[PDB]
Subunit: 143 residues, 2 copies
């Protein structure tokens, strides 16, 4: 049971629970990586225990060391080049996560100020199925 918690944190197993599904429409496009990073960081600060970012074609499991780089219209998230609209699935307390997205002056203003829109849906069940890139150990062995 310690293994489950550690495995969810590292993104090595899928997770399910209550949470939110956030859609970001970015017609400009204008949402730069810094804005996406702020959104992710605010969700984590608000208690999200698993986060996945999707576009129409790809899904990425977010970890604490995830890279989000690129330009509006083309955000590279742990190597996957995503284009809008984006979907963010986050497991946590749904009204807490929604409130975090509605803080005056908060992360969502980065989306709004570039002509984007954010819809935050609260859900009884959100499935974070994407896994972080697995790699086999070449040197470490069990004791």
């Amino acid at each position: 049971a310690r293994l489950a918690a550690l495995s969810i944190l590292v993104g090595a197993v899928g997770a399910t629970g209550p949470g939110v599904m956030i859609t970001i429409d970015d017609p400009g496009p204008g949402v730069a990586p810094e804005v996406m990073i702020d959104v992710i960081n605010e969700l984590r600060a608000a208690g999200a225990e698993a986060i996945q970012i999707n576009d129409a074609h790809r899904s990425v499991r977010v970890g604490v060391d995830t890279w989000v780089v690129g330009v509006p219209g083309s955000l590279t998230v742990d190597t996957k080049v995503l284009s809008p609209p984006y979907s963010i699935l986050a497991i946590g307390d749904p009204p807490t996560l929604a409130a975090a997205m509605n803080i005056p002056g908060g992360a969502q203003d980065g989306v709004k100020r570039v002509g984007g829109r954010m819809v935050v849906q609260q859900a009884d069940r959100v499935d974070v199925t994407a896994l972080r890139q697995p790699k086999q150990h070449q040197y470490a062995q069990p004791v």
Copy 2:
């Protein structure tokens, strides 16, 4: 087979394999949190598969969300307060891990500039026995 690999990845169990032992003597003391974070990231760069940070009395198993705060002489790593000298154990290709330590402009140069010393010992076997202690998830459950 897969359970052991996962368990090592997430820091649920100990690991053994070739690697390095890094000793940092800090007589000032002058080694700040930033330098220890650089040590960890250099070792990760070089392909470290398990990392443990020791002082004379305590041990911390490094993981993806490991943080370091504090001041020279008293570094808090994942809630454990450590004081020099420090010992860092890392499992990986010993020549690659050693090479990382010798790259100019990083952690070793930071140690040197504050009057400290680093010793890097390559070893055919290093044991990482400290385990990570996960926080209880309130919302996410495994699938």
